[PDB]
Amino acid sequence: MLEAQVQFASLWKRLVECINGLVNEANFDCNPGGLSVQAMDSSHVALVHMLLRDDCFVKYQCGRNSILGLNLASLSKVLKIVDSNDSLSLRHDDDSDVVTLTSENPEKTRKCEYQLKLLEIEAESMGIPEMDYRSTVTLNSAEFAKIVRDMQVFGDTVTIAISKEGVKFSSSGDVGQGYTFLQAAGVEVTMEEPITLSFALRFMGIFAKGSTLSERVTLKFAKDSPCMVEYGIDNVGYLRYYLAPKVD
Amino acid sequence: MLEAQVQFASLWKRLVECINGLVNEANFDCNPGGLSVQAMDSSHVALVHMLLRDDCFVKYQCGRNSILGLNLASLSKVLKIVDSNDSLSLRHDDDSDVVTLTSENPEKTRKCEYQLKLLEIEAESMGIPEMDYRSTVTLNSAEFAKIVRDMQVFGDTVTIAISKEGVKFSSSGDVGQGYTFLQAAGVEVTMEEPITLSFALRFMGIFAKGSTLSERVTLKFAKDSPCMVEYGIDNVGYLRYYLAPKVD
Amino acid sequence: MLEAQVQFASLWKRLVECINGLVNEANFDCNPGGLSVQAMDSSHVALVHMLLRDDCFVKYQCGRNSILGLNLASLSKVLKIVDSNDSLSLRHDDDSDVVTLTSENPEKTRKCEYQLKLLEIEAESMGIPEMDYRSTVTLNSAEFAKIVRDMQVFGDTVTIAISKEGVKFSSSGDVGQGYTFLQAAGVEVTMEEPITLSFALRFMGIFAKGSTLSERVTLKFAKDSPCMVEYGIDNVGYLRYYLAPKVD
Amino acid sequence: MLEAQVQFASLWKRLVECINGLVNEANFDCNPGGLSVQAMDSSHVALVHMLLRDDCFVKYQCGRNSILGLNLASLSKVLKIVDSNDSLSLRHDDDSDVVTLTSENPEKTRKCEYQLKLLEIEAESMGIPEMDYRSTVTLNSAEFAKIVRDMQVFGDTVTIAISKEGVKFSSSGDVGQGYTFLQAAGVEVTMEEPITLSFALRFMGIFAKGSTLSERVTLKFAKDSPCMVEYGIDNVGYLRYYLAPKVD
Amino acid sequence: MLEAQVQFASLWKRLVECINGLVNEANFDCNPGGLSVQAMDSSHVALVHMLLRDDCFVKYQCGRNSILGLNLASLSKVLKIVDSNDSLSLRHDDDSDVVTLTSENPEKTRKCEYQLKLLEIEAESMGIPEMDYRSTVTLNSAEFAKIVRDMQVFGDTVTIAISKEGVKFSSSGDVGQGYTFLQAAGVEVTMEEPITLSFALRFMGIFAKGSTLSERVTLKFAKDSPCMVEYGIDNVGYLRYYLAPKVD
Amino acid sequence: MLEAQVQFASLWKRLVECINGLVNEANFDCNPGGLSVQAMDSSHVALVHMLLRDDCFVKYQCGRNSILGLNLASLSKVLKIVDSNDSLSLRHDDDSDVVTLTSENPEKTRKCEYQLKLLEIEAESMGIPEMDYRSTVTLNSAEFAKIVRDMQVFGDTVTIAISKEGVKFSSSGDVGQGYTFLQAAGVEVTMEEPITLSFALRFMGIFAKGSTLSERVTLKFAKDSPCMVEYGIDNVGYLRYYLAPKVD
């Protein structure tokens, strides 16, 4: 039945790390369009949506829509041991109860094959937000990551404030008060009005692992609405996170 | 009221690590001479004196003598997140209760500002020891650091013995007995008589973080007197530690 | 009166790490032939035999056969602090109760000397039951090490299966099932018949630290018999491990 | 909608201490039968099974089988602060993501309520065993506890030897050799063959905290098979541990 | 010059523990009214005011107002070694630089005398924040102490909420969320309106050692104002703490 | 062939604690007179002499003089686990590398047997001191113990001054200056002239554990000579310590 082979296992390694940060199990919705994972954290505050378009793979075959529930904790453990530069083929057979991962060297002198039992995961229900986003900032993904790590020395909450001149990340706590201001000028603001929301750093931190997938990152906001943080996986996919604003 | 800007935040980062090893809070005596910290460990066995002369800073302004008590634990946490190669401006205002640290990139596209609450710390009450050291050894700071780490596998006490031919560090314990002998030159002994004292490795270890500030380190001894370990910060300051001998 | 000087302390450092993985104390049998260590794990399932031929040392002197029991935990701690590229002289004197390690820089500007108390160790029973190894595989030592680390995500047991055309390492557990197949050449199989044994990963893992001593590693098998894993120390010695199969 | 109220929080306090000794997280299988916990240590050598029958509780309500994963480290911390003689109600609501603990005084003048986040814990494969047991010894639980603490001065392994006349616990090590012999007929041996097995004291020690639940303790053995140590929680449940012998 | 003798040294022992929790040195204002200490923590968030009226002592004499700075750390160390049921006479002389503590047995067969050096302690910064306290709760001092210890398992901040029916202490953190609700009577609420403030547990904890001085404790609150926690020392003095709310 | 059985193991427990405070190994000189231990601290400043007369034991048998070297650290560990109120039989056999300790219940329902390996310990130089003691003070042993613990808050040295009216213990240091004066009777001074010596509290502290053996303790002094501190063990033995003065 299903077969999806990527050339460089890095991609899967880096992806699973990202999504496993948020949830331990997830359904892999596989279509002829490609693989998607959509999942919420157990507190129903944050959502991941990842899509790997079929052009992502050097070989992709998915006639009908199959759905594969997996333990991301186990999957993460197996992927930890796969070499970055080896190929990796995900394969599931008609009514099999197991998915198989197959890695091979460029030189074809080593072949690894792993098998994971599937789960039993109930359909998500709570869906993507339907926004229309007034503001947008795009910045270096690793700067973003650093900023959220940094803001965590102060508090558990970051306030992001977008203005014509740039974006200001702010946090408070016992240690003191911090901010990092990035100037527009590199940081591409493009907003229709000044806007200022707050968020849980716990989740922003989980999101910021996306920096392993994309040199840049885009944040999208809308007053009193879940923000989005998007990491393009070149032209062959995305990783997208949504997070509820804090209280207020 | 105070403004002290260094070009490279590294300096502050490395300093605070050193002094935070010994004490959690300290008063920064700030004069038109520059910043000084003088402080004892809670066991009253060891003393730090640090001075950053005003020529240390690319910009320095301190009309009246203010004293700023700080939590070095918090300060350390904030400095951990400042980029080494960014600038860093320490500033305190007349009516304030807070000191502010302001970092900027070389490119001026990112500005960070942190604020720490001040403390009322009781003014040290313990004077620098009497000088006139009949003995001096100077050595590579990182060798010194390694030696004290090493001597700790044996005991909690190191015996330093200076002779015309060099210096011998010795320790004992369950594991066994060790020594490291460094021969004169590269090791600049310059002494008036052979002399042999013992010291707590706990503190020698704390002092040895000074190796981050200065390629070389000077130890000065005097029979029955606190030794000194000095790290020059170029020509623009020093870091100086004093420690009681072990007698018994 | 024993003296054994190696030019580069690395060797001793890397060796003691390897054997200390298996046992905490061991007798160093010293002859004019060189040093040997032979020891079993406390469960009597696995055996180490190390030999450093006298050509191994830049200086070797052992008139009569002495035996020196040592605490490898202590020895490991002392060797951790000796620089890799320093020389290292092991010396024991006529009924002394202490062995001494002496390190010197290439430049002779630093000299270190450590002393360990000897033990009292009873000579072990098992004594290498050996030979008649029907099958043999040789492979890159670091690949081997990686494979055993990897197989540990699945189980506590690895099944090694040698066939003309390569070796297959397999494991099972909660996470799932995995294998790594290496194809023959690079992997030098040389066997008289297909053969398939199982082993405790705990011990294979301990053995795999041998990769620090030798770019390649040889495994030797024999139906219903302890396997051997051998790491050559470049013509001048070996490190050799033997391990009971799992049978049922 | 789950509810389980015990009259005296002591029970929960003492139980969680016992099981937290072995594992940091565990699933609470809750049925109309009552609560059960079944879990292995991370080395897969030892198994706990606890059952609190529904008659254990002054109020019990569990329509369907729910499973609640918990951090026993956190749960232990919360239970440390609950008064022994207060009541304690464990409550979970439909898709709540949190369990709540509610304590009340006998006099209803003080009410405490705590909330713990649940975990997704993967269901444990290893299923007790089906088993006979040829031998049986029952003894004062606190004597047993003391004996295992004692045997730990000698070694990491205890040898239990059952004979018609009593049971002999034995251990060895650097310190020397010890034994404690308890005579039958107070010690209820009841066996169909003499036998002698060995076990890890680390785990026997963990098990022996059961003495807080039950004045007596029963050990059951079977040649070459996991022993069992059982603590009856009066008539309203049990705590049961299984441990692999040391073999060879 | 000063003489103040208490019959039972317990009092001093218990007091110094309490105040030493907050500050390491303090000025003892000594008048013919009695001894008073008024002192702030280094963060200027918390104030202690202690008064021991002259009727507190079996013998009291202080013609002029002297001020004695003392090291409470040293004083604490000396008081640790004074027997609870011995008498204790504090004495300072005209020309002295030292205060002396003199202990004697009931039977006059043992006499101890200790001498502490005085300090020049600068800050008289202070300022009791007297105000209209709208709300008042009085409760068993040891329950209060337990509650703050308990709330610390969750967070570093407690929210106290006074209502007609009682007072609710609440905290949050990694471990979870907790509360303790005490119902009105035994717990004597007496308030003019419902009121809800937050406070640092670090300081509430320091204050709660007051339970050694007084079976009951009174807390007084006022919207946007420092709370007060008061421990009466019989009829012969008080210990009173004031603490800034957490606002943000 | 030696056998020495005491009725209550307490005695051995309390003794070994006392002497293990000073040294880690010691020879047990066993004669028909009884058991004696004599040992010096490794700094050759302090000496223990213990004697248990043969009437001490409910059963004692020692035809010839045997000497048993023991590790007091191990012995202490074994004795920690022996019940106070059990009997304890020490037994050594003709040409046996091991001594055996055998404990039994009053009720004979439990028997424990431990075996320690002996050591070859070289006879020390260690001559008991010569003199006839000019001064003598006898006091409650636990008061003495408390006094030395107390004097340690000040210094590492205590000055004991005997006069017609009583004895004065004095110490100095960073914390301050202390004394305890005990008045003559209850404290039995009996001296031929006033005399004032100083001693290391480290050792006085070690000695003061003798209070577990004897309600009273006697100190004996002689100008410029080792003091003695003696603890009678009923009428059936003594424990005696000697310590060099500090000369200044």
mmCIF file of C-alpha atoms in Angstrom, chain C residues 128-134 220 222 225 242:
data_model
loop_
_atom_site.group_PDB
_atom_site.id
_atom_site.type_symbol
_atom_site.label_atom_id
_atom_site.label_comp_id
_atom_site.label_asym_id
_atom_site.label_seq_id
_atom_site.Cartn_x
_atom_site.Cartn_y
_atom_site.Cartn_z
ATOM 1 C CA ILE C 128 39.974 -18.512 28.591
ATOM 2 C CA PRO C 129 38.269 -21.730 27.470
ATOM 3 C CA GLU C 130 38.932 -20.707 23.819
ATOM 4 C CA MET C 131 39.499 -21.691 20.172
ATOM 5 C CA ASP C 132 37.947 -23.456 17.257
ATOM 6 C CA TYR C 133 36.264 -20.387 15.934
ATOM 7 C CA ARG C 134 34.300 -21.412 12.895
ATOM 8 C CA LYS C 220 34.683 -14.676 16.357
ATOM 9 C CA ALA C 222 31.473 -20.914 17.498
ATOM 10 C CA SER C 225 30.451 -21.242 22.784
ATOM 11 C CA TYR C 242 34.708 -13.200 25.719
#
